[PDB]
Amino acid sequence: SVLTKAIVNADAEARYLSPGELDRIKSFVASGERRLRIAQTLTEARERIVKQAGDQLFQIRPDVVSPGGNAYGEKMTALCLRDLDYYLRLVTYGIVAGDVTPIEEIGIIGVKEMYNSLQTPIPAVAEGVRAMKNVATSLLSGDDAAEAGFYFDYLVGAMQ
Amino acid sequence: SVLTKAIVNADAEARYLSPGELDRIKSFVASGERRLRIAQTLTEARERIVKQAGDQLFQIRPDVVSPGGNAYGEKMTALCLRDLDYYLRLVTYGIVAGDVTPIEEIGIIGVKEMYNSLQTPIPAVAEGVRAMKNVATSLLSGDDAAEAGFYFDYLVGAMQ
Amino acid sequence: SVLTKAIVNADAEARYLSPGELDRIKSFVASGERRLRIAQTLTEARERIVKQAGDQLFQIRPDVVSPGGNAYGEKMTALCLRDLDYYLRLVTYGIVAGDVTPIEEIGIIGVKEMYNSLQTPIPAVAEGVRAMKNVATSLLSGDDAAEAGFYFDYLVGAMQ
Amino acid sequence: SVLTKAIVNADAEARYLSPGELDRIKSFVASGERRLRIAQTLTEARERIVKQAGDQLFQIRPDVVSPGGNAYGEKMTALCLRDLDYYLRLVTYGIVAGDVTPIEEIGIIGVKEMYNSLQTPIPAVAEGVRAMKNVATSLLSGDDAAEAGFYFDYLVGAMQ
Amino acid sequence: MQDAITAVINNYDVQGKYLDGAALDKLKAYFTTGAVRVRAAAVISSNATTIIKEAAAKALIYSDLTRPGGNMYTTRRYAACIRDMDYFLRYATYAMLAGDPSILDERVLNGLKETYNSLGVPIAATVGGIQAMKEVVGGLVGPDAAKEASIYFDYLSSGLS
Amino acid sequence: MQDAITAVINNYDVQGKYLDGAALDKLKAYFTTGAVRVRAAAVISSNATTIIKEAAAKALIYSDLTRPGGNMYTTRRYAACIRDMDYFLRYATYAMLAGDPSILDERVLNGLKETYNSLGVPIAATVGGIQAMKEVVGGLVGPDAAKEASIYFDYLSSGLS
Amino acid sequence: MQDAITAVINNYDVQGKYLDGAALDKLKAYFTTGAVRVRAAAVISSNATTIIKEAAAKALIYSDLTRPGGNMYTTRRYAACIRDMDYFLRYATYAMLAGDPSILDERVLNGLKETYNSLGVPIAATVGGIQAMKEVVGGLVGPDAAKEASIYFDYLSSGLS
Amino acid sequence: MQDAITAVINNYDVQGKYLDGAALDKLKAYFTTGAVRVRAAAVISSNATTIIKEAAAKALIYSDLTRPGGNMYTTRRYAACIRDMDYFLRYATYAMLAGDPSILDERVLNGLKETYNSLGVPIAATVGGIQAMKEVVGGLVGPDAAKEASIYFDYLSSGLS
Amino acid sequence: FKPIRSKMDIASMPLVQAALKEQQATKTALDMSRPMFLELGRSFKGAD
Amino acid sequence: QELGTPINERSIPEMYVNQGVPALKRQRKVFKQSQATDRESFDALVTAAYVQVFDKDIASYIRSEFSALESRLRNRETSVKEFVRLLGFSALYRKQFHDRYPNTKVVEFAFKHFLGRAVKNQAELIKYHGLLGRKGIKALIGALVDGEEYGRLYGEDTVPSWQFPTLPAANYPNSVELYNRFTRQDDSLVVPS
Numbered sequence A, B, C, D: 001s002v003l004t005k006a007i008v009n010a011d012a013e014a015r016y017l018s019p020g021e022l023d024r025i026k027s028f029v030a031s032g033e034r035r036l037r038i039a040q041t042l043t044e045a046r047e048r049i050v051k052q053a054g055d056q057l058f059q060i061r062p063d064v065v066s067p068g069g070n071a072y073g074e075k076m077t078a079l080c081l082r083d084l085d086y087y088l089r090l091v092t093y094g095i096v097a098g099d100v101t102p103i104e105e106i107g108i109i110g111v112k113e114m115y116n117s118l119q120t121p122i123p124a125v126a127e128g129v130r131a132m133k134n135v136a137t138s139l140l141s142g143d144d145a146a147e148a149g150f151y152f153d154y155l156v157g158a159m160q
Numbered sequence E, F, G, H: 001m002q003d004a005i006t007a008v009i010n011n012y013d014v015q016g017k018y019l020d021g022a023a024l025d026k027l028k029a030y031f032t033t034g035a036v037r038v039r040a041a042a043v044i045s046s047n048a049t050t051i052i053k054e055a056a057a058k059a060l061i062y063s064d065l066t067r068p069g070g071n072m073y074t075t076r077r078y079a080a081c082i083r084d085m086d087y088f089l090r091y092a093t094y095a096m097l098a099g100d101p102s103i104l105d106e107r108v109l110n111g112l113k114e115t116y117n118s119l120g121v122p123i124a125a126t127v128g129g130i131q132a133m134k135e136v137v138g139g140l141v142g143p144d145a146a147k148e149a150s151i152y153f154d155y156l157s158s159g160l161s
Numbered sequence I: 001f002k003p004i005r006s007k008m009d010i011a012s013m014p015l016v017q018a019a020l021k022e023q024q025a026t027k028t029a030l031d032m033s034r035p036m037f038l039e040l041g042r043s044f045k046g047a048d
Numbered sequence J: 001q002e003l004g005t006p007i008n009e010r011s012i013p014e015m016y017v018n019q020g021v022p023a024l025k026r027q028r029k030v031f032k033q034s035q036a037t038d039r040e041s042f043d044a045l046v047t048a049a050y051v052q053v054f055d056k057d058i059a060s061y062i063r064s065e066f067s068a069l070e071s072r073l074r075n076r077e078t079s080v081k082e083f084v085r086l087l088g089f090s091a092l093y094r095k096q097f098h099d100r101y102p103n104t105k106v107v108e109f110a111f112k113h114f115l116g117r118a119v120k121n122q123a124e125l126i127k128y129h130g131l132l133g134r135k136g137i138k139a140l141i142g143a144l145v146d147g148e149e150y151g152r153l154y155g156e157d158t159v160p161s162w163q164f165p166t167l168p169a170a171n172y173p174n175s176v177e178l179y180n181r182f183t184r185q186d187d188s189l190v191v192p193s
């Protein structure tokens, strides 16, 4: 989180916390209520976002649901939707934490290796993540929409 | 409104108003308070009807929110939701006025040239309107629901 | 004329012409051809203007052609029409000259004593001049119409 | 300014503004953009014009920067160049106003008495102003050059 | 042209605003006075030619207008004047039913003053006839709608004058 | 007295500043509305007596002011009131032409309050008449110069009040 | 209407003169640029609706003109505005093909200014849209016909202004 | 005395009008500048003595004022002059907090001039001291409230002179 | 004691006048924290 | 650059614009018959002569009472000096500026209207008030118009107009106080003695 990053930086430098670091600490704690509200909204709308993102992703990449595709079949598509739910949960974790430490340590480190082993289209994962981004942003006010879109865009970029 | 449609024909043939016209004005004026109460609930549920309608529209056809779609992007989707809100407002206008004069003069005449220049799917817009009809009917009593459904039905018919 | 007024105000200070008054002189000479064209156009249609304006004046103010009216009788009406023709000639002179110097010396100063001695209604003469203005502006282009209407308005206000 | 001089005559004669005065006001406001451009150009070249005017003035008559000269010494030469800056500002004010009332009220009436009291050579000051005119006209197009040269010649004539 | 309801709807559509309490109050205000307007219009339609007859006899006829040299002289001009009176009464009925003077401003008063000035029509006589038919309709309609009927006749008279 | 241009020039001269971007923007803003001021001034000059007549009819006459015991009773006081009314109109025209109330403060408002207190003139009635010409001039000039004409009438009314 | 050839022919017929070296030179000057005009006309005919669409995107929509209260607000007004744009494009194509703004004066410019004045159409916004169409057409056609097409768009904008 | 809030409230009470959009805009514009005034007043209060010392050193002392026969000669008059400078600084702080020079007019300037001619105090020297304090205060308070602080010192100097 | 009146309008002060212009711009130009579909269908003028 | 900047920054401009003599000293026009030829300019001279005398307030009431004087002036039978003198002989001037004031305020009103200043000193009050009471207005006006000061300042053809005197002492504030007074605004005599 923000506190973890500030603490690790001060420890690596071998000094006490900078006043600007305390400034970002105070801003981060003051933004706690709004971040919790955004996380609550996304958690309550977790099913709709995942389902709609799946439908939109299958429209741009119809071949993934096809005979020579990774997600061919009802349970193979269910696994893809469960993956999208996992990434939605990780985005909620990142929003509540204030940075992308949990998202990084859970879902992008080695994701290329895992999906390469599974023979899974990663660009299709990225398209699904973008679809979840659009569906989630449709359910939020503008400022919170940009705040969540930051983490969704980071997930899209890191999955490349 | 009913007044304009019942006065224009009288001016056209050059006579004073006929008793059928007068008594249809009586039915219209007697239904005035119930018309106002009907229109008030739709304004209470303005920003909550459009969110439900957008989800059903995009679930029925996700291709408009696809990369080759007209509504691709956050701001494109916001514009479509704004147009749906516009048509909800026009439906409230028609409900209160008792006819379709304001609806026609504001948002149907030339709408085909509108959406052809913008290259927007008019049949998609029709399903978007029908979603608003269903969500509005879900929050009204049966007689009032049918009354609003008449104007939603007219908008859907004129849109295509 | 503009030349006359510039020369007179320069001679008031007993100094050579300032450059600004020279730009006055160039603007006036450049507009002089258009002014003379407008005056010739009004000159070609002098009889129709006075006739229609006299009809308009007698419509608005019928008391002057009433038994207790200054212009009661056919010869008294003919004298009124001759006065209107005089004012039209003065307006054409003003338009060609550019400055209103001839009109004031010919048919403005002393006109109060004019119509007080003759017992003629000055407001009625004003109404006749306004009708002349309308009929004259009906036969001119918009810029030319405004250019003539300014002098007509001077006549109406200066007979106040 | 021309507005002030027209209003002063109108109030002295106790009457509304004449059509000639209104026309000169109109031309005066029409010329405003080119006047503002000329004033802006002179304002941007303030330092260069002043420095070059001082250099030409001292070349033409170096006796003023001699030991027995009025402007001998660094702190005395600074005041002479500041006076030249004052007159350049007055010229820009005159150009923007359209005539020389600001120049008269601020820098010429009593200038003979002040410079006689300070024992400075008024003919030297006039040549210094003329050098400023030459440097200023070096940075302007022909029409704007003549327009500024009018005010510069006014200053040169007044300091005489 | 526009009625009260369409006028309020247009006045809110220009601002891009939903119908709120004040606008619905205006609409309910028009809705409450519905009965008097249709009853006044029905009685006026039933008594139109009688109204024109009394208005003519009370404001125009038995005067120098009907005699030679007047504007109302000759059967042609008399028929023109009575047709104009019937026209005015009909459009006043329309404006009373619609609750708005827009129809009168559009289809009646537009150019009428200048055309009557060109044709020599007596504007004062026209206003007197309009007020006479206003009086007769106020008598006929009863207390329910006499005031509403009178307002648009006053509007026509004021626009002409 | 000062206009907009001379006001800017003096305000910069007292600080010893060359005309910068802000002063140039102020002068540009004045110059962009030069023609409308001239047109409105010409209209007011042409319609001067009618503005006074309708303003007096709307605000002063047909009341106790014109009756015995009123301040504008008798021909002398009526003429004095209309001459003052015309003074206000002419100086408002000067202010709207110059774009500055400096002339109004310099040549009209100084000593006016205590002069009217000495003579017994009703200041409230004077403010009413000034607002009367404000409405009339706003009707005459049109949308273009209505507010700019109105600001100086408001200046005169606030100075008297 | 008339093209360059017809204009020269009429200007010599009004003197009753057979064609001389100067007229032949003018005809040669027009003939030397015939191919580029036809190419630009074909490109404009191909991309007419696209030219309108990016023209509207850069100049008109996403502004107060589209919001409630804009002149192009409502479907009817937007359809009328885009029809006006396609009219301007077609007549500019005609003018550039004929090498003469006579057709633009005869069938486009006359009446249009006061027509927009009566309708309330923003002339400045229309001129801006015409300029956007001009720049799109110039970018599309290439250096060969850019100035030749742009002169008629400037003619239309100047006639409107 | 009166601040910005009471000035708006009194200006509306004299008309007997409820608060409208303009009054609320004025009140919001005052409320937004709340913390800046408090910070500037705190800085001035903390640095009061140094401001007086520096202003006196720059403008008054080391001259004929403090040498014998001068108006600031003797401890009895030196203490009085520095007390007067303290009074001016304190009331300038009050005026800056209130956002209105009404306190300066009511409790500083009235009778002050004729008091100074009665005592023999040099008005020009007092004005010079006030401007020196103005320069020092503008240096201290920062760019946020420099103009706001300087306006009241200029008000005091113009009232005295 | 005579009333001392007021010669300087409070809205002409540097801080208040500097805040009024910002108040105008913030209310007219920019949007805020309601949904964009609601904020894209707004007419900034009220009766013009 | 900094040697021409104000020092003690003028934090409120146009509080320093108005200092010094008023702008009215140089923001008004002087009228001369010698350069007032032609009908348009002659009317301005005539209407200005009714404002120097009569002090601009009861001058607007004048419609046609002085019509024989204007005719002779236009025909060049009498000079502007004669016109101004005959304007002070009329019953309107006597009614307005002599019939409601003490005999010494008539001297002050006569000075400010026909010379442009107030009374110089006590030795001039004694001369010009001991003549007005001896022979009335028609001698006091003749003494002012035919004096050496009038001949120096205005000569034959020139409207009197306000002058802002520098000397002698207390003639500038005394004159300016008279200048900035509307008609009937204040009737204190300013310079009693």
Ligand SMILES: *C[C@@H](*)[C@H]1/C(=C/c2[nH]c(/C=C3N=C(/C=C4\NC(=O)C(CC)=C4C)C(C)=C\3CCC(=O)O)c(CCC(=O)O)c2C)NC(=O)[C@@H]1C
Residues within 6 Å of the ligand: C057, C064, C065, C069, C070, C071, C072, C076, C077, C079, C080, C081, C083, C084, C086, C087, C106, C107, C118, C120, C121, C124, C125, C128
């Ligand atoms: C619209 C007509 C109005 C009107 C007029 C009227 N005029 C007269 C008589 C005269 N009018 C003039 C006018 C002029 N002489 C000039 O030099 C000029 C300037 C160019 C003018 C305008 C003169 C000289 C006369 C006298 C006769 C003559 O010309 O020799 C009359 C007749 C009055 C009589 O007593 O006979 C009338 C009626 N009357 C109206 O009702 C109209 C408003």
Ligand SMILES: *C[C@@H](*)[C@H]1/C(=C/c2[nH]c(/C=C3N=C(/C=C4\NC(=O)C(CC)=C4C)C(C)=C\3CCC(=O)O)c(CCC(=O)O)c2C)NC(=O)[C@@H]1C
Residues within 6 Å of the ligand: E060, E065, E071, E072, E076, E077, E078, E080, E081, E082, E084, E085, E087, E107, E108, E109, E112, E115, E119, E121, E122, E125, E126, E129
């Ligand atoms: C009480 C009647 C008064 C009167 C009237 C009068 N009118 C005419 C002629 C016309 N009236 C009209 C009117 C209209 N045209 C429109 O479009 C409308 C609104 C939709 C109106 C009201 C017109 C156009 C004419 C001229 C053509 C025609 O006659 O139809 C006349 C005839 C005059 C003539 O013969 O030229 C009269 C007499 N006259 C009075 O005295 C009454 C007061």
Ligand SMILES: *C[C@@H](*)[C@H]1/C(=C/c2[nH]c(/C=C3N=C(/C=C4\NC(=O)C(CC)=C4C)C(C)=C\3CCC(=O)O)c(CCC(=O)O)c2C)NC(=O)[C@@H]1C
Residues within 6 Å of the ligand: F060, F065, F070, F071, F072, F077, F078, F080, F081, F082, F084, F085, F087, F107, F108, F112, F115, F119, F121, F122, F125, F126, F129, J057, J058, J182, J183, J184, J185
């Ligand atoms: C609408 C008329 C109101 C009114 C007015 C009234 N005024 C006077 C007398 C004077 N008014 C003036 C005014 C001015 N002198 C100036 O120089 C200017 C500005 C340029 C002004 C406004 C003056 C000086 C006088 C005194 C001299 C004079 O009478 O001319 C009077 C006459 C009072 C009397 O009889 O003594 C009246 C009646 N009265 C009303 O009731 C109206 C509200």
Ligand SMILES: *C[C@@H](*)[C@H]1/C(=C/c2[nH]c(/C=C3N=C(/C=C4\NC(=O)C(CC)=C4C)C(C)=C\3CCC(=O)O)c(CCC(=O)O)c2C)NC(=O)[C@@H]1C
Residues within 6 Å of the ligand: B064, B069, B070, B071, B076, B077, B079, B080, B081, B083, B084, B086, B106, B107, B118, B120, B121, B122, B124, B125, B128, G061, G062, G063, G066, G067, G072, G073, G074, G075
């Ligand atoms: C369900 C949504 C569909 C869709 C819509 C879409 N619309 C636009 C752009 C505009 N739409 C309008 C609409 C109106 N103007 C009016 O006056 C009325 C009547 C009340 C309407 C409905 C306008 C003016 C625009 C232009 C932009 C603006 O408003 O300023 C767009 C954007 C197109 C672009 O090129 O940016 C879209 C996407 N798209 C879909 O796929 C749906 C079917």
Ligand SMILES: *C[C@@H](*)[C@H]1/C(=C/c2[nH]c(/C=C3N=C(/C=C4\NC(=O)C(CC)=C4C)C(C)=C\3CCC(=O)O)c(CCC(=O)O)c2C)NC(=O)[C@@H]1C
Residues within 6 Å of the ligand: J019, J020, J021, J022, J164, J165, J166, J167, J168, J169, J170, J171, J172
């Ligand atoms: C060292 C100069 C200081 C100064 C002075 C200043 N004075 C004026 C204007 C006037 N001074 C007088 C003086 C007198 N009245 C008398 O009777 C005489 C003898 C003849 C004296 C000495 C008067 C009457 C005036 C006003 C009329 C006039 O200008 O002649 C001015 C000019 C003010 C202006 O133009 O508005 C100044 C500058 N100013 C300083 O800064 C010095 C301390």
Ligand SMILES: *[C@H](C)[C@H]1/C(=C/c2[nH]c(/C=C3N=C(/C=C4\NC(=O)C(CC)=C4C)C(C)=C\3CCC(=O)O)c(CCC(=O)O)c2C)NC(=O)[C@@H]1C
Residues within 6 Å of the ligand: E061, E062, E063, E066, E067, E072, E073, E074, E075
């Ligand atoms: C007589 C044998 C019949 C009859 C007639 C009758 N007429 C009136 C009233 C009017 N008649 C006219 C007629 C004309 N106006 C014209 O311009 C022309 C063309 C030359 C005609 C014929 C008019 C204008 C009137 C109204 C009054 C007026 O002139 O001002 C009446 C009176 C009706 C009333 O209500 O008072 C009568 C009785 N009556 C009969 O019994 C015969 C059949």
Ligand SMILES: *[C@H](C)[C@H]1/C(=C/c2[nH]c(/C=C3N=C(/C=C4\NC(=O)C(CC)=C4C)C(C)=C\3CCC(=O)O)c(CCC(=O)O)c2C)NC(=O)[C@@H]1C
Residues within 6 Å of the ligand: F061, F062, F063, F066, F067, F072, F073, F074, F075, F078
């Ligand atoms: C009657 C024979 C003539 C006539 C007169 C007329 N007067 C008015 C209105 C007013 N008349 C006065 C008059 C005076 N006020 C005074 O102090 C004196 C001196 C004693 C007089 C004579 C006034 C003040 C008014 C205004 C109203 C008021 O008194 O408050 C009108 C009305 C005009 C209007 O537009 O309303 C009329 C008609 N009209 C004629 O035709 C006769 C020749």
Ligand SMILES: *[C@H](C)[C@H]1/C(=C/c2[nH]c(/C=C3N=C(/C=C4\NC(=O)C(CC)=C4C)C(C)=C\3CCC(=O)O)c(CCC(=O)O)c2C)NC(=O)[C@@H]1C
Residues within 6 Å of the ligand: H061, H062, H063, H066, H067, H072, H073, H074, H075, H078
């Ligand atoms: C000397 C033993 C101590 C000392 C003195 C000191 N004084 C000043 C400056 C001033 N002293 C005065 C004094 C008086 N003014 C009066 O009217 C009287 C009564 C007769 C006195 C005693 C004044 C007015 C000044 C200001 C300058 C001026 O006179 O114009 C200084 C200079 C302070 C400075 O420059 O900031 C000093 C140093 N300092 C010591 O340490 C000694 C113990």
Ligand SMILES: CCC1=C(C)/C(=C/C2=NC(=C\c3[nH]c(/C=C4\NC(=O)[C@H](C)[C@H]4CC)c(C)c3CCC(=O)O)/C(CCC(=O)O)=C2C)NC1=O
Residues within 6 Å of the ligand: A057, A064, A070, A071, A076, A079, A080, A083, A086, A087, A106, A107, A118, A120, A121, A122, A123, A124, A125, A126, A128
């Ligand atoms: C929270 C971190 C995390 C993730 C993400 C994760 C993912 C994950 N994705 C899986 C399968 C899968 N994932 C995909 C994904 C896709 N197919 C496409 O076309 C696209 C490129 C993409 C969807 C947009 C597919 C097709 C499978 C099934 C592969 C198979 O059955 O062989 C599996 C194997 C089955 C199982 O879950 O037991 C895992 C573990 N596990 C974790 O712990």
